Amino acid sequence: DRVKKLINSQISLLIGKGLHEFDSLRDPEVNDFRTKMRQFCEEAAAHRQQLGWVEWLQYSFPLQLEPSARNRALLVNVKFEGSEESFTFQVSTKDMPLALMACALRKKATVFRQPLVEQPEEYALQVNGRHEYLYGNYPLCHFQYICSCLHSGLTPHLTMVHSSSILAMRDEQSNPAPSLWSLEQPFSIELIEGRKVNADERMKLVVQAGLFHGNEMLCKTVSSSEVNVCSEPVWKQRLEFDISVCDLPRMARLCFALYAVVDCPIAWANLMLFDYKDQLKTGERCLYMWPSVLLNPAGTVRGNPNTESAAALVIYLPEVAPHPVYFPALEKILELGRHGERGRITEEEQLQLREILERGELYEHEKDLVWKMRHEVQEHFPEALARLLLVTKWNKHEDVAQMLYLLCSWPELPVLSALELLDFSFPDCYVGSFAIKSLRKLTDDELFQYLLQLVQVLKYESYLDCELTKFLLGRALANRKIGHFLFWHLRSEMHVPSVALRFGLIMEAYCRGSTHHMKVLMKQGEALSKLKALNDFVKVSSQKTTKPQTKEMMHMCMRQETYMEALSHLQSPLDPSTLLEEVCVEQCTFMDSKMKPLWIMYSSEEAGSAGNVGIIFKNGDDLRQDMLTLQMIQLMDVLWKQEGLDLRMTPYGCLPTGDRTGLIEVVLHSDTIANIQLNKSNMAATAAFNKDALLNWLKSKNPGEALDRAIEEFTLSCAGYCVATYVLGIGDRHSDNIMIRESGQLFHIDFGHFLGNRERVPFILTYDFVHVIQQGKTNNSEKFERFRGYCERAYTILRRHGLLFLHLFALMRAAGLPELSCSKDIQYLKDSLALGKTEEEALKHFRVKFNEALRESWKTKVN
Ligand SMILES: Oc1cccc(-c2cccc(N3CCOCC3)n2)c1
């Protein structure tokens, strides 16, 4: 069909990889993944196009509620769809959207002299010119939009939208018309030869081979004989391992490292001993190697796609049996594991077992006791599953069967425990499947919070068709915001060969489940394409002429029909609720920094003042660490708000979209501390002492009694960013990467470095900010110590969630970020949070750290 042909080509251009490329690999695993996930996603699409109108609002416009939500007078402007006539009426912040709706309908029934057929139940309230709605049984104050409006002071502008208008949205966005355990001999392989090997001729080539189950060795590593350096080395030798074939676990991976010696790392390659269909692999394998930068268990189990240039090791998996051998079914495993003597020892060991299960590495005796008392772990200490899993001998078929028997009847664990279990330290497929089962209870807001880390876990996966991929696919198809960000997280890494096939396959499947959103996403990709072209021009022009010259030329380029069409009328990749309507060419510019980032401004008549939004397009820098930093600061703000603490944070959007490409949300009405401190003449802020400048700027933006609120907003945000930077080890902080909103809110930009990269980042307190907290007065202990009280409260809240930060940072090790590549980087978080201490101990350690930062600050106060 011609419709099927166009969608296939639109998916090809969207994901940046031709679908013909999947067919050309002729791999049954890819073929089975494509068929099964296409069928799964098309089923979700069929379920969706029949949702009820409120359920469809829940899919397309998921509610944006305050972390607290999951009295005071309020003024709201309401209009009915299309009609310019609006009504401004006074409601309460504790009133429900329904009372606001009944209120709007009585007005409409009086202005147009008619009794209305419609009940307030037939409507939803759209936030003007935004893909955002207020509905459900929540007070208005609980909504992020109203909450935002209350804190700024602006009047909420809403539109009454009927059930028929949303059902038409549902309808118009529709998809088109239609045995192993007897094998006791040692595992061995023949190392045949190597191809296209590049190394110094004076050296010899060595091939190191290891058997792993995640990070753990299953036996000793074995090395081949040393053979002279040349293009095609020949070994033709048998490498025998210290593990029987029966003892190989399901997720065992054979890892190879090729290097040179007189060590000179050349390349590495890994493969799974069992295939996607549970069969024990046999015959020849050509391993297209990845060039090193020595065994890499965490590395991908798929070969290098660049067959032309990659080094290629040829190996032979021996035929251990005349007929094919598959991993035993769960039915056999449980039968073997059903047999085991129950641990029945004294009260002495019970107190000793309690001590370590509630407690980090264990001793040989501590491990043996946990294993012996495994039945008691299931029944009395279920949350110690991860401890029990780490002591299990994964190199023993009998021990694995006994662990798996307990797991299959293990109670579901909290979301926090499940997050720990997705770590590469837990590579078992049944463990992985258990971890997902416990994560099904995640809310969409919680899933959204951890989506970034979940997408990184996909890089650990041994097969394409996996439980985590199906989970993410199902949830993405069930929530448009989830769908939007899952797409971008994957799309932004299509330039990385190790993930391009897996990510491309997930994105294709998603597109099969939502034809309309694929087109919505293509419109975003067309804008990004133009921004790249425009940014390339600016980069060249900025080196050949003056700034007004490049800016005027940039404008001419944007004003072209092609650019005006592509850059306007799209959902924002930073936030699909944000609609970027009319590009305001005259307000567009570029920044003076290395990559000359573009500064793009938008307007929307329908949204009014809220439709005025900016995006920064930046090309040449990996923005993944910046996004992780901002997402961690956003989590801090959520955890603080859950404890009733609002530190007036600015968690602006940051999204990588391509190879060293991404967008940054513009926070309007904000300026850098560096600019304010330049202390320009002929301005309201013009100071007598440079220390007076921020406060003078604050005064000019906040006249009269508004100044008290601005100092408080500054104080709160300062406390939050001081704690955020200290906990995350955010260094290289100066007046040009610190910004201030006209409300007084302090926020940080461009997170180039974190986790103290390795020098331990000290707590930072700077006099000019102490000067605003203290209201300009030289001595204001009342104000300063109230700030120290805000810092201390924010710190102890993060500590109570110390394990959530460690589990998320652990899953992030999969991302491949230079400042997050091992255990040293995580030790920074463990140290900054002081989780190996008591609250009184860590608080005193924080107070000593803060006091040390006040003493360093006081060196500037002496002058
Ligand atoms: O997270 C980053 C990464 C790189 C650059 C920036 C950056 C640089 C200048 C301005 C700017 N902001 C955005 C927020 O709104 C004010 C301008 N962000 C932020």
PDB file of C-alpha atoms in Angstrom, residues 258-348:
ATOM      1  CA  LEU A 258      43.089  -7.935  22.063  1.00  0.00           C
ATOM      2  CA  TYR A 259      46.291  -6.065  22.943  1.00  0.00           C
ATOM      3  CA  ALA A 260      50.029  -5.737  22.292  1.00  0.00           C
ATOM      4  CA  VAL A 261      53.096  -6.251  24.599  1.00  0.00           C
ATOM      5  CA  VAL A 262      56.928  -5.790  24.368  1.00  0.00           C
ATOM      6  CA  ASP A 263      50.498  -3.177  27.664  1.00  0.00           C
ATOM      7  CA  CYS A 264      49.098  -1.538  24.479  1.00  0.00           C
ATOM      8  CA  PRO A 265      45.252  -1.829  24.307  1.00  0.00           C
ATOM      9  CA  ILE A 266      44.070  -2.450  20.717  1.00  0.00           C
ATOM     10  CA  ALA A 267      40.422  -3.650  20.782  1.00  0.00           C
ATOM     11  CA  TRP A 268      37.656  -5.496  22.692  1.00  0.00           C
ATOM     12  CA  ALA A 269      34.500  -7.584  21.853  1.00  0.00           C
ATOM     13  CA  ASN A 270      31.822  -9.397  23.907  1.00  0.00           C
ATOM     14  CA  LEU A 271      29.059 -11.890  23.027  1.00  0.00           C
ATOM     15  CA  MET A 272      26.327 -13.809  24.929  1.00  0.00           C
ATOM     16  CA  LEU A 273      26.890 -17.625  25.265  1.00  0.00           C
ATOM     17  CA  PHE A 274      23.127 -18.180  24.800  1.00  0.00           C
ATOM     18  CA  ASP A 275      21.141 -16.457  21.963  1.00  0.00           C
ATOM     19  CA  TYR A 276      17.777 -14.576  22.210  1.00  0.00           C
ATOM     20  CA  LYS A 277      15.995 -18.000  21.843  1.00  0.00           C
ATOM     21  CA  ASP A 278      17.830 -19.613  24.883  1.00  0.00           C
ATOM     22  CA  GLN A 279      20.084 -21.775  22.593  1.00  0.00           C
ATOM     23  CA  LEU A 280      23.717 -22.409  23.599  1.00  0.00           C
ATOM     24  CA  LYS A 281      25.746 -20.953  20.692  1.00  0.00           C
ATOM     25  CA  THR A 282      27.926 -23.200  18.458  1.00  0.00           C
ATOM     26  CA  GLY A 283      30.065 -22.936  15.285  1.00  0.00           C
ATOM     27  CA  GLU A 284      32.103 -19.973  13.945  1.00  0.00           C
ATOM     28  CA  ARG A 285      31.779 -16.340  15.118  1.00  0.00           C
ATOM     29  CA  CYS A 286      33.351 -13.277  13.535  1.00  0.00           C
ATOM     30  CA  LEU A 287      33.665 -10.728  16.292  1.00  0.00           C
ATOM     31  CA  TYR A 288      33.940  -7.194  14.848  1.00  0.00           C
ATOM     32  CA  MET A 289      35.939  -5.465  17.578  1.00  0.00           C
ATOM     33  CA  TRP A 290      35.546  -2.043  19.194  1.00  0.00           C
ATOM     34  CA  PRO A 291      38.801  -0.025  19.471  1.00  0.00           C
ATOM     35  CA  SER A 292      40.035   0.541  23.069  1.00  0.00           C
ATOM     36  CA  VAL A 293      40.474   4.004  24.725  1.00  0.00           C
ATOM     37  CA  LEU A 294      41.407  -4.379  29.968  1.00  0.00           C
ATOM     38  CA  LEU A 295      38.366  -6.666  29.594  1.00  0.00           C
ATOM     39  CA  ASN A 296      35.146  -4.673  29.214  1.00  0.00           C
ATOM     40  CA  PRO A 297      32.145  -6.735  30.620  1.00  0.00           C
ATOM     41  CA  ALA A 298      29.837  -3.648  30.595  1.00  0.00           C
ATOM     42  CA  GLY A 299      30.418  -3.178  26.846  1.00  0.00           C
ATOM     43  CA  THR A 300      27.786  -4.068  24.189  1.00  0.00           C
ATOM     44  CA  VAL A 301      27.315  -7.742  23.087  1.00  0.00           C
ATOM     45  CA  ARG A 302      26.824  -6.654  19.468  1.00  0.00           C
ATOM     46  CA  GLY A 303      29.688  -6.376  16.979  1.00  0.00           C
ATOM     47  CA  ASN A 304      31.111  -3.194  15.474  1.00  0.00           C
ATOM     48  CA  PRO A 305      28.897  -2.237  12.428  1.00  0.00           C
ATOM     49  CA  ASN A 306      31.917  -0.655  10.617  1.00  0.00           C
ATOM     50  CA  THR A 307      33.005  -4.052   9.131  1.00  0.00           C
ATOM     51  CA  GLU A 308      35.404  -2.201   6.688  1.00  0.00           C
ATOM     52  CA  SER A 309      37.757  -0.695   9.380  1.00  0.00           C
ATOM     53  CA  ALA A 310      37.211  -2.779  12.575  1.00  0.00           C
ATOM     54  CA  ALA A 311      39.631  -5.501  13.763  1.00  0.00           C
ATOM     55  CA  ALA A 312      37.901  -8.932  13.503  1.00  0.00           C
ATOM     56  CA  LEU A 313      38.548 -11.924  15.859  1.00  0.00           C
ATOM     57  CA  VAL A 314      37.440 -15.313  14.536  1.00  0.00           C
ATOM     58  CA  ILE A 315      36.418 -17.843  17.191  1.00  0.00           C
ATOM     59  CA  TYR A 316      34.823 -21.330  17.300  1.00  0.00           C
ATOM     60  CA  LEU A 317      32.131 -22.219  19.839  1.00  0.00           C
ATOM     61  CA  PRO A 318      32.379 -26.067  20.016  1.00  0.00           C
ATOM     62  CA  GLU A 319      29.396 -28.413  19.500  1.00  0.00           C
ATOM     63  CA  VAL A 320      29.035 -29.804  23.055  1.00  0.00           C
ATOM     64  CA  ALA A 321      26.090 -32.085  22.040  1.00  0.00           C
ATOM     65  CA  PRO A 322      24.940 -33.742  18.729  1.00  0.00           C
ATOM     66  CA  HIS A 323      21.499 -31.985  19.015  1.00  0.00           C
ATOM     67  CA  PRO A 324      20.715 -28.280  19.954  1.00  0.00           C
ATOM     68  CA  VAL A 325      20.930 -27.362  23.689  1.00  0.00           C
ATOM     69  CA  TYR A 326      18.620 -24.632  25.124  1.00  0.00           C
ATOM     70  CA  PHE A 327      18.696 -23.109  28.662  1.00  0.00           C
ATOM     71  CA  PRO A 328      16.319 -25.105  30.971  1.00  0.00           C
ATOM     72  CA  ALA A 329      12.761 -23.730  31.261  1.00  0.00           C
ATOM     73  CA  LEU A 330      11.539 -22.039  34.510  1.00  0.00           C
ATOM     74  CA  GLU A 331       9.556 -25.336  35.122  1.00  0.00           C
ATOM     75  CA  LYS A 332      12.882 -27.302  35.470  1.00  0.00           C
ATOM     76  CA  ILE A 333      14.735 -24.482  37.397  1.00  0.00           C
ATOM     77  CA  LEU A 334      11.992 -24.230  40.096  1.00  0.00           C
ATOM     78  CA  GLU A 335      11.903 -28.034  40.452  1.00  0.00           C
ATOM     79  CA  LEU A 336      15.709 -28.115  41.178  1.00  0.00           C
ATOM     80  CA  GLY A 337      15.477 -25.016  43.442  1.00  0.00           C
ATOM     81  CA  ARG A 338      12.419 -26.362  45.378  1.00  0.00           C
ATOM     82  CA  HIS A 339      14.931 -28.675  47.153  1.00  0.00           C
ATOM     83  CA  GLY A 340      17.045 -27.173  49.931  1.00  0.00           C
ATOM     84  CA  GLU A 341      17.324 -27.546  53.719  1.00  0.00           C
ATOM     85  CA  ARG A 342      15.906 -24.620  55.749  1.00  0.00           C
ATOM     86  CA  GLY A 343      18.382 -22.638  57.870  1.00  0.00           C
ATOM     87  CA  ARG A 344      17.665 -23.331  61.558  1.00  0.00           C
ATOM     88  CA  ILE A 345      20.359 -21.832  63.889  1.00  0.00           C
ATOM     89  CA  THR A 346      20.379 -19.893  67.300  1.00  0.00           C
ATOM     90  CA  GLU A 347      19.354 -16.314  68.429  1.00  0.00           C
ATOM     91  CA  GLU A 348      23.108 -15.345  68.418  1.00  0.00           C
TER      92      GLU A 348
END
